């Protein structure tokens, strides 16, 4: 296709998994032929936030772990498509 302005929406998801006295690690695999380490924001409230910035569009493989144990929900598949232009959905207070 084209080479430059790709634009790919970020990956923001919250998995129901508590985390207090443990480390949560993960990894992403792009269809290009490489791998990039995702991001996790431990809330220590009973859930975890996953943030990943895809560079290419396609099916990516995300494999998370917990102190050496496949968290309840990983790995997970997430497709990446070009960022939309417009979208309905007003905000409220």
From Swiss-Prot:
Signal peptide: none annotated. Filamin repeats lie at residues 8-79. Ubiquitinated by FBXL22, leading to proteasomal degradation. Highly expressed in striated muscles. Weakly expressed in thyroid, fetal brain, fetal lung, retina, spinal cord and bone marrow. Not expressed in testis, pancreas, adrenal gland, placenta, liver and kidney. It is found in: Cytoplasm; Membrane; Cytoplasm, Cytoskeleton; Cytoplasm, Myofibril, Sarcomere, Z line. Coiled coil: none annotated. Silenced in MKN28 and MKN74 gastric cancer cell lines due to aberrant methylation of the gene. It is linked to Myopathy, myofibrillar, 5: A form of myofibrillar myopathy, a group of chronic neuromuscular disorders characterized at ultrastructural level by disintegration of the sarcomeric Z disk and myofibrils, and replacement of the normal myofibrillar markings by small dense granules, or larger hyaline masses, or amorphous material. MFM5 is characterized by onset in adulthood, clinical features of a limb-girdle myopathy, and focal myofibrillar destruction. Muscle-specific filamin, which plays a central role in sarcomere assembly and organization. Critical for normal myogenesis, it probably functions as a large actin-cross-linking protein with structural functions at the Z lines in muscle cells. May be involved in reorganizing the actin cytoskeleton in response to signaling events. Belongs to the filamin family. Homodimer; the filamin repeat 24 and the second hinge domain are important for dimer formation. Interacts with FLNB, INPPL1, ITGB1A, KCND2, MYOT, MYOZ1 and MYOZ3. Interacts with sarcoglycans SGCD and SGCG. Interacts (via filament repeats 17-18, 20-21 and 24) with USP25 (isoform USP25m only). Interacts with FBLIM1. Interacts with XIRP1; this interaction is mediated by filamin 20 repeat. Interacts with KY. Interacts with IGFN1. Interacts with MICALL2. Interacts with ANK3. Interacts with SYNPO2. This is Filamin-C. It comes from Homo sapiens (Human). The chain holds residues 1782 to 1861 of 2725 of the full protein.
């Amino acid at each position: 296709g084209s080479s430059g302005s790709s634009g790919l929406r970020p990956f923001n998801l919250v998995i129901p998994f508590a985390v207090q006295k443990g480390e949560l690690t993960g990894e992403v695999r792009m269809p290009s032929g490489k791998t990039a380490r995702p991001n996790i924001t431990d809330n220590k409230d009973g859930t975890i936030t996953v943030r990943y910035a895809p560079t290419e569009k396609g099916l990516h493989q995300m494999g998370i772990k917990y102190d050496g144990n496949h968290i309840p929900g990983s790995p997970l598949q997430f497709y990446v498509d070009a960022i939309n232009s417009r979208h309905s959905g007003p905000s409220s207070g």
